[PDB]
Amino acid sequence: GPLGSESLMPSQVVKGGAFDGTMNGPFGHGYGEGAGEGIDDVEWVVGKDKPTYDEIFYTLSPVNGKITGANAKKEMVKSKLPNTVLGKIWKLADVDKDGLLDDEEFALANHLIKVKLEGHELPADLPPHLVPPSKRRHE
């Protein structure tokens, strides 16, 4: 034991003038966690970058308020991808899978394009905080 040999504590701490009487046996720990409930805040990150995708939208020349998927495919093709990433970008951006993309569907299309550009591919998941207004629905 501690007689005939000095029993040193694993961490040698010096409590100068502090006679410590830690009552052992109770165990617990809880900090003030910031609880975020469903406050009425519905704003997908595209509402603030749509102007970019929408300007390119009219820049590629849309028809009847949406781009023919042809030009949308051009856009995501020049985004420098194989048909693998490209195909799943299309099917992850176009919720209806029309063969076209409206101003918001380009918004998503190009948004996921810059998401893959972040250095990570798309996970084939479509979150309710990234679904264009027309498709605000979890089914």
Q: Which residues bind Ca ion (CB under 5 A)?
A: 94, 96, 98, 105
Q: How far is the CB of 121 from Ca ion (least distance, A)?
A: 21
Q: How far is the CB of 54 from Ca ion (least distance, A)?
A: 15
SS3 100: strand
Residue 100 in tokens: 């076209």
User: 75 or 105, CB closer to Ca ion?
Assistant: 105
User: 81 or 95, CB closer to Ca ion?
Assistant: 95
Q: How far is the CB of 92 from Ca ion (least distance, A)?
A: 11
Return the amino acid letter for 53.
Y
Residue 57 in contact with residue 103, Cβ under 8 Å? Answer: yes
Residue 26 in tokens: 């109770």
Annotated binding site for Ca(2+): 94, 96, 98, 105
How many residues are listed for the chain in this entry?
A: 139
Return the amino acid letter for 127.
P
Task: Tell me which residue has its CB nearest to Ca ion.
Answer: 96
Query: Of 71, 76, 79, nearest to 92 (Cα)?
Result: 76
